[PDB]
Amino acid sequence: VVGGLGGYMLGSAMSRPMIHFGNDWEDRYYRENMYRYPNQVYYRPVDQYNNQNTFVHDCVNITIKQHTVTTTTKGENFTETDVKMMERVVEQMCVTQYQKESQAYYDGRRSS
Numbered sequence: 036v037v038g039g040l041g042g043y044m045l046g047s048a049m050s051r052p053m054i055h056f057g058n059d060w061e062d063r064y065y066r067e068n069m070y071r072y073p074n075q076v077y078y079r080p081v082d083q084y085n086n087q088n089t090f091v092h093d094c095v096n097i098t099i100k101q102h103t104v105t106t107t108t109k110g111e112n113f114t115e116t117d118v119k120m121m122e123r124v125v126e127q128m129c130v131t132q133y134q135k136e137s138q139a140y141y142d143g144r145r146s147s
Contacts, residue, residue, distance in 0.1 A: 037101070037104065039097075039100055039104075040077075040097060040100070040101065041079070042079070043077045043079050043097050043101075044077065044078060044080075045076075045077045045078075046075050046076050046077070046078065046132045047075075048074060048075055049074055049076075049132070050074070051072075052124070052127060052128070053066070054120070054123050054124055054127060056120075056123065061120070064116075064120075065120055065124075071111065071117070072117075072120070072121065073098065073102065075128075076094055076098045076125055076128045076129050076132050077094065077098045077101050078090070078093070078094040078097070078129065078132060078136070079093065079097075080136075081133060081137050081140060082140060087130075087133060087137065090133070091129040091130055092126075094125070094126075094129035094132070095122055095125045095126050095129060098121075098129070099113075099118075099121050099122070099125060102121070
């Protein structure tokens, strides 16, 4: 019984990028502890938004919202440090989910 998810789907599966955070430790931290974070993101149909940005943001928000709900309360806890890395990983994954969904929904589909 989610409260905040108007039928947001979950993507099929992806891989774990490296995220070049720019701190020497945000990298070393991340590469060690990456096994915690989802290898997936939640989204709505790209076709519903007119623009990538608003949509991919909504994908950051919703993915993390689904975790701070489902994954959390009585499971995991994303500390404030994780929270910042989640936003990094998930945005940089929502742009990938989109490089399928958008272009797949454009190449022989939309026309702008």
